[PDB]
Amino acid sequence: MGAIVILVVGPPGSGKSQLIKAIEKLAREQGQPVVTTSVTSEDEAKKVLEELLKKDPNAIVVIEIKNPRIAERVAKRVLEEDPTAVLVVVVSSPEVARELRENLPNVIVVVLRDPEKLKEAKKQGTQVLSGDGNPEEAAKQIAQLIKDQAGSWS
Ligand SMILES: [N+]
């Protein structure tokens, strides 16, 4: 099918590790292998992606990003390394999400509050899903969105 790459973007305290735990658990239940990596710089991402996303592995790769400022370059690096990867960016801030949407043609999702900033994000194509603070629902919602817009997830 191809690689599904999920960037999970947000500062410490955004729910990333719990969201990632829920995504891994649901994926195991569906018989799909998931691997995770946490990156702090664009080259770290290059290093791990150039090793891992070698031959469009049929796998889910989750990338944890604690520094939202690097998200865009890491997203671009993913596409550079594997132009045949599905890329889903789960972002904590609606403002970051809007900025990433403007700079990429990639699925960008917010589960997370300010109604005005959220509307602005959605206007640039940010997708909103229920399950902020409920990792299990969130994981379910993300998997449904990937199925409907990207493929089986198998
Ligand atoms: N919200």
Numbering used by the authors: -1 to 110, 112 to 153
Sentences from the paper on this structure:
The crystal structure of one of these designs, PL2x4_2, was determined and found to be nearly identical to the design model, both in overall structure and in the P‐loop motif. As a result, the blueprint with a 14‐residue helix, a loop with the AGBB ABEGO torsion pattern, and a six‐residue β‐strand was identified as the most optimal for allowing the Lys residue to point inward to the P‐loop cradle, facilitating the interaction with the β‐phosphate moiety. The P‐loop motif binds the phosphate group of the ATP molecule, while the adenine moiety is enclosed by a loop structure leading to the last helix. In this design, PL2x4_2, the adenine ring forms a hydrophobic interaction with Pro134 and two hydrogen bonds with Arg112 and Gln116. Arg112 is further stabilized by two hydrogen bonds with Gly11 in the P‐loop motif and Asp131. The de novo designed protein with the ideal P‐loop motif demonstrated ADP binding and ATP hydrolysis abilities as expected. However, these abilities are lower than those of typical naturally occurring ATPases. The simulations suggested that the low binding and hydrolysis activities might be due to a suboptimal binding pocket for the adenine and ribose moieties of ATP, as these moieties were detached from the binding pocket during the simulations. Furthermore, we found that the loop (the C‐terminal loop connected the sixth strand) adjacent to the binding pocket exhibited unsteady dynamic motion. Consistent with the simulations, each monomer in our crystal structure revealed different loop conformations, suggesting that the loop's flexibility might indeed contribute to the suboptimal binding pocket.
